[PDB]
Amino acid sequence: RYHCTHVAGVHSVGLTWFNKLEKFLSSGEEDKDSLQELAAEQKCLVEHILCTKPLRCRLPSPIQGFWIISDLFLGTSMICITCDFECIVRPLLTTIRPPSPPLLCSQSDKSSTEILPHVLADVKGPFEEHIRGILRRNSANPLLLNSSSKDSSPPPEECLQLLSRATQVFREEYLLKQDLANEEIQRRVKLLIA
Amino acid sequence: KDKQLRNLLCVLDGDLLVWDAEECAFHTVTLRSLSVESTGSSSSGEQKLLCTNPPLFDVNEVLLSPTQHHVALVGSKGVMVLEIPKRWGKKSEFEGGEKTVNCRTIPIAERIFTSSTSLLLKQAIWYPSETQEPHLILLTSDNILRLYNLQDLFTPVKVISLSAVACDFGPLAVLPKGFGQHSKEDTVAYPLYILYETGETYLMYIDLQKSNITVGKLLGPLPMYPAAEDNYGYDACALLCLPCVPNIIVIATESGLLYHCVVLEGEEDDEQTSNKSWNSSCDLIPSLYVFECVELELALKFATEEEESLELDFACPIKLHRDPICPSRYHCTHVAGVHSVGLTWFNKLEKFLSSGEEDKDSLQELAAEQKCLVEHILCTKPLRCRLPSPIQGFWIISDLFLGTSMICITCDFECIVRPLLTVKGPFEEHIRGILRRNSANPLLLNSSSKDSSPPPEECLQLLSRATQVF
Amino acid sequence: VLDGDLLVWDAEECAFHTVTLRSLSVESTGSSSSGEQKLLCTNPPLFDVNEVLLSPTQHHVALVGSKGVMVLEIPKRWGKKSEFEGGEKTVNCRTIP
Amino acid sequence: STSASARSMCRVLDDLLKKMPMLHTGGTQTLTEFELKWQHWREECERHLQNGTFSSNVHMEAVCRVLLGDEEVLLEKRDLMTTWYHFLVSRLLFKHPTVKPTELHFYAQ
Amino acid sequence: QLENLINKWSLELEDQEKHFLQQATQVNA
Amino acid sequence: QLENLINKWSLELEDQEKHFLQQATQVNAWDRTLMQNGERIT
Amino acid sequence: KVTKESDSILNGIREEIAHFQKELDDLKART
Amino acid sequence: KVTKESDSILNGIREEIAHFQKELDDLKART
């Protein structure tokens, strides 16, 4: 992972293929499956974290200072200072992808060689990886800095397009995925009750 | 509404199992109980088989294992195997007649499909052994065959690079002389035929007990005869091996063409055309003789007086189904219907190949033009203004008590059940010759899209066609 | 950031303001000014500072501009809180062009 | 070795103890890097305690709470440390591993 | 609607074909 | 201001992800134990 | 408009199937 | 001309922050 600072904001970029490249280069010359797994299209993760130019009519508030705290007591956090001395502190994850919270049913009992009925072996991967695949995000709404230039309210078409885009991202990447996750949790709870 | 062709049903010991994608479960219907006129409750014999861990992918196909103890749930993004629960009690019902049975489910190769988002499963097939542990073969969009055992779900037993749209097994055969230096034992293996989208067919001998270097070599492309100007097309979508001697391969195209290929053994070149191959491994490569080509009526052809209104080539993927009762018959399911194809020359080919090299009369009897029998059984797109009702499940019951019957389930859950059949010459053969049919009117499904009567013109054209056939 | 203190360069004062981040975690009911120190350049940069670079040894800070570089020697930490020069509000730091 | 239930819990606790970050007088590790690792490790300990992993054994639960620097529990075990300065050091180990010499007086008092 | 009518006439035609073959067999007897 | 709001929502999302995994993951562990006990009872 | 025309064609095909079945059964009765 | 455009952009950012807060609170209520 690395971070990009520019006059209009801050981005984070995480190389999601890195661990597969490492696995492939650690695999001997005969592992065609690791090369096919690396060649399977995997984009990096880009997150626009901070936008200091949310509107076209606004001047950016340039980043004047940027740092990543890695301390055992303070935890992991990004610090950004803008040209108007706005201090913005954000917790960062220790990984490009957060580990999913263990499902209450992931008892890692290393003692059940329970013969999973062969009819479930044809589902390539644990059902959890499939749900993680559905919930995978490609974009997010950045933190918008309101540059404190007192002297006009921003403007209408471009404002409506920006609001439409932002609302669409919230609908697709947040609400719809939360509703699907809730339905899956409720289905699992009903099955466990029965 | 682009409802894809699926096969979401199987029959086990006279119970119909129907996959419910919304409940992630099988509904079971005991077919033998429906034969008994029991005056009491329209619900006596339905059980639900619940997946303990449901598939995380859309199930497109259900495959019963040769051992009849496992069901593979197959989708383009994964495979899961359901362990069939034990039968006991007075009716031989699952878990003694429990209404809802929890079935152990086992994901196969899950990490490969989750890590490789561009990877697609093209086909899954069971290894055709009834005596061995059930092995699943996965054909994937990277042209790799992966063999899995239900004991090791993460590591394939065998990985074979084909450096492919369909594959099917022929019957257990003795390997040709040359596939193994110096063993006096006739080694037996299953021939796996492998079809590419280009129509190119390859052969591989698979034995799971013997890891010999020759067992698992890819052979071909198998030369096709006669030569065709189009090389037999580039839209190949399905392969079926018929359990015939010699092996008969059926290749199906998306355009509705069916090629009937007789597998011929390779000849040892008689020693007089030694001009230059420097590969000192004469692997006798078998050839494919295209005996017949047949076009399916995928949509009902109407005589329009306009010979030029754009044949909208109604192309769609065909799925081939072996008939368990008649080895020279098979069935084709596609988005618009169901066809049956019967090889009427098969018994004459068998007679000719059983006749010694001097029987010119048997060759003349085989060379006498005999087309296969094609029957359009079910049409789910009877009119051009109608969307098809795609087949979601297809099976052939062969049971001594139930008899012989086709079951079809459509995408609108319409269950359709049809019984299937199992002076030179006597005057009777002449009358049979006159009464010989070349076409029939299919069963027309009225897709229950309430919201318009069809155009009167298309209805009159359909009635005209049907009346003409009669 | 040095050892959990945030150092912020002030271009008008030619100095670092230091904020101890670990003291901000303690809900101390008493004075919003307990832990700010100012590190004064003994010889201020004659150019606009665009970048601050901590040395790998964490004993020096380079003040980098398009027209020059100056290195600030980080003062010694001592006393009960491990503050610069024992907790002096204003510390003179040696600077080296 | 006493019971299967105890074995599973001991394995978890053993893992937590094994993964506890310790500063080495010769490692290229910066104090910040260490603090991040330590925080992560602590979060893991907290997760196991919230999940009620050790609810069947009061002693293992107490150890895990000690690992989290629970002051109430540390004080409950006051008889084992015998002295305030042992208590101080234990407190520093689990709550403040990167303590600066200038701050030591505050913790000691 | 047209598809349901076509399917009905196909089933009626197959039933009439079976009845005709049975009658032809009886007439021959 | 926008950057502070983005950082707040990122931290809230990471906390919700952790809570969701705990709620799941635990149910999946119980389901495995229940299935094993069902096989033993059978 | 399409639904009434499709229903009329389907009814005409059913009438013709019923007529042909009657002619086949008369031919079988005569033969 | 600049003041009205800046006010329009600042209002659109405030509307989007209010919309996202509502979606987060619905997601929290659902979860």
XYZ file of C-alpha atoms in Angstrom, chain B residues 87-303:
217
model
C -32.846 -44.090 3.058
C -34.674 -46.130 5.746
C -38.165 -46.867 7.223
C -41.358 -48.431 5.720
C -41.366 -46.377 2.462
C -37.539 -46.195 1.933
C -37.763 -42.375 2.377
C -34.794 -40.064 3.153
C -33.836 -40.129 6.871
C -36.929 -42.307 7.614
C -39.506 -39.819 6.146
C -38.433 -36.480 7.732
C -40.077 -33.528 5.882
C -36.821 -31.501 5.954
C -33.438 -33.279 5.830
C -30.100 -31.500 6.304
C -27.662 -32.703 3.623
C -23.898 -32.293 3.918
C -22.521 -30.064 1.155
C -18.903 -29.898 0.017
C -17.485 -27.012 -2.104
C -15.012 -28.193 -4.818
C -12.059 -25.977 -5.847
C -13.732 -22.882 -4.188
C -10.430 -20.944 -3.842
C -9.724 -21.199 -7.625
C -13.070 -19.586 -8.628
C -12.891 -16.960 -5.816
C -9.244 -15.989 -6.630
C -9.611 -16.053 -10.461
C -12.662 -13.820 -11.153
C -12.231 -14.228 -14.971
C -12.205 -18.062 -14.714
C -15.393 -19.798 -15.874
C -16.398 -23.417 -15.464
C -17.403 -24.588 -18.983
C -18.406 -28.153 -18.038
C -18.267 -30.598 -15.121
C -18.486 -34.401 -15.600
C -18.207 -37.414 -13.294
C -15.469 -39.957 -13.978
C -17.568 -42.929 -15.314
C -16.470 -45.449 -12.608
C -19.168 -47.105 -10.451
C -16.556 -49.051 -8.372
C -14.087 -46.270 -7.494
C -14.507 -43.222 -5.289
C -16.437 -40.523 -7.236
C -14.079 -38.181 -9.115
C -15.205 -34.906 -10.667
C -13.552 -33.518 -13.826
C -13.756 -29.749 -14.333
C -13.270 -28.166 -17.773
C -12.496 -24.452 -17.309
C -12.075 -21.432 -19.639
C -8.228 -21.606 -19.315
C -8.237 -24.928 -21.328
C -7.333 -27.007 -18.242
C -8.936 -30.269 -17.118
C -8.859 -30.560 -13.288
C -9.629 -33.907 -11.625
C -10.896 -33.723 -8.007
C -11.458 -36.486 -5.453
C -14.157 -35.886 -2.769
C -11.435 -36.680 -0.117
C -9.098 -33.789 -1.230
C -11.231 -30.817 -2.251
C -8.426 -28.227 -2.528
C -5.764 -30.128 -4.506
C -6.703 -31.663 -7.880
C -5.580 -35.337 -8.208
C -4.592 -34.512 -11.822
C -4.221 -31.242 -13.771
C -4.046 -31.569 -17.561
C -3.266 -28.625 -19.852
C -5.070 -28.919 -23.214
C -2.492 -26.593 -24.868
C -12.463 -26.242 -25.154
C -16.307 -26.135 -24.852
C -17.285 -29.744 -24.080
C -15.998 -33.237 -23.228
C -17.565 -36.700 -22.730
C -16.410 -40.249 -21.935
C -16.644 -43.232 -24.229
C -17.005 -46.791 -22.830
C -14.012 -48.529 -21.182
C -11.662 -49.550 -24.035
C -8.401 -51.518 -24.430
C -5.573 -49.066 -25.210
C -4.211 -49.328 -28.802
C -0.929 -51.295 -29.195
C 1.877 -48.675 -28.826
C 0.421 -46.819 -25.760
C 2.992 -48.396 -23.392
C 6.355 -49.980 -24.131
C 6.478 -53.727 -23.293
C 3.539 -54.640 -20.941
C 1.933 -57.983 -22.038
C -1.260 -56.827 -20.222
C -4.099 -55.198 -22.148
C -4.375 -51.924 -20.212
C -7.931 -50.527 -20.179
C -8.789 -46.813 -19.879
C -11.703 -44.464 -20.507
C -11.442 -42.471 -23.781
C -12.240 -38.798 -23.039
C -13.236 -36.868 -26.177
C -12.619 -33.090 -25.945
C -14.369 -30.595 -28.261
C -13.127 -27.097 -29.079
C -15.453 -24.254 -30.229
C -13.695 -24.607 -33.662
C -15.160 -28.162 -34.046
C -11.644 -29.615 -33.423
C -12.001 -32.857 -31.430
C -9.181 -34.371 -29.340
C -8.855 -37.738 -27.545
C -7.291 -38.595 -24.175
C -7.110 -41.955 -22.371
C -7.717 -41.595 -18.601
C -7.063 -44.228 -15.931
C -6.989 -43.071 -12.267
C -5.262 -46.291 -11.011
C -2.217 -46.056 -13.361
C -0.058 -42.912 -13.664
C 1.674 -44.036 -16.896
C 3.221 -41.290 -19.144
C 1.022 -42.515 -22.082
C -2.219 -42.395 -19.984
C -3.275 -38.715 -20.166
C -1.458 -37.695 -23.388
C -3.691 -35.449 -25.549
C -4.165 -36.958 -29.062
C -5.355 -35.062 -32.159
C -6.957 -32.980 -33.496
C -8.704 -36.130 -34.795
C -8.872 -35.913 -38.635
C -12.480 -35.631 -39.900
C -13.692 -37.378 -43.105
C -14.922 -36.431 -45.674
C -13.225 -33.007 -45.899
C -15.830 -30.184 -45.587
C -15.316 -26.701 -47.172
C -16.276 -24.971 -43.869
C -14.313 -27.546 -41.763
C -17.665 -28.453 -40.039
C -18.198 -24.899 -38.628
C -16.818 -22.736 -35.754
C -19.870 -22.615 -33.378
C -19.516 -26.061 -31.731
C -21.330 -26.057 -28.330
C -21.800 -29.700 -27.138
C -20.287 -33.204 -27.427
C -21.910 -36.587 -26.614
C -20.277 -40.020 -26.953
C -22.916 -42.735 -27.589
C -22.097 -46.118 -25.878
C -21.895 -47.822 -29.295
C -19.247 -50.134 -30.819
C -17.646 -48.443 -32.709
C -17.998 -45.242 -30.644
C -20.344 -42.661 -32.215
C -19.630 -39.016 -31.309
C -22.371 -36.398 -31.681
C -21.095 -32.817 -32.186
C -23.736 -30.055 -31.878
C -23.469 -26.439 -33.148
C -25.299 -23.295 -31.903
C -26.904 -23.073 -35.414
C -28.644 -26.459 -34.781
C -26.376 -28.759 -36.869
C -25.690 -32.246 -35.453
C -22.694 -34.174 -36.840
C -22.741 -37.974 -36.343
C -19.086 -39.055 -36.264
C -18.061 -42.760 -36.323
C -14.711 -43.228 -34.519
C -12.322 -45.179 -36.792
C -9.122 -46.821 -35.499
C -5.857 -45.468 -36.979
C -4.229 -47.656 -39.676
C -0.563 -48.681 -39.482
C 0.801 -47.077 -42.697
C 1.571 -50.083 -44.944
C 5.368 -49.623 -45.601
C 5.247 -47.834 -49.102
C 4.587 -44.103 -48.323
C 7.575 -43.423 -46.029
C 7.966 -39.736 -46.935
C 9.090 -37.885 -43.841
C 7.650 -37.565 -40.445
C 10.757 -37.581 -38.161
C 8.596 -38.222 -35.052
C 9.431 -41.889 -34.229
C 6.250 -42.204 -32.057
C 3.572 -43.575 -34.401
C 0.706 -42.937 -32.011
C -2.109 -44.447 -34.139
C -4.406 -41.362 -34.057
C -8.062 -42.427 -34.580
C -10.142 -40.619 -37.228
C -13.716 -39.252 -37.183
C -15.941 -40.289 -40.108
C -18.893 -37.846 -40.374
C -21.557 -40.357 -41.429
C -24.469 -37.881 -41.332
C -25.243 -34.178 -40.691
C -28.691 -33.068 -39.426
C -30.191 -29.596 -39.010
C -32.663 -29.192 -36.115
C -35.770 -27.045 -36.565
C -34.883 -24.840 -33.523
C -37.841 -22.545 -34.384
C -40.930 -23.521 -36.439
C -40.323 -22.663 -40.148
C -43.355 -20.909 -41.746
C -43.763 -20.676 -45.529
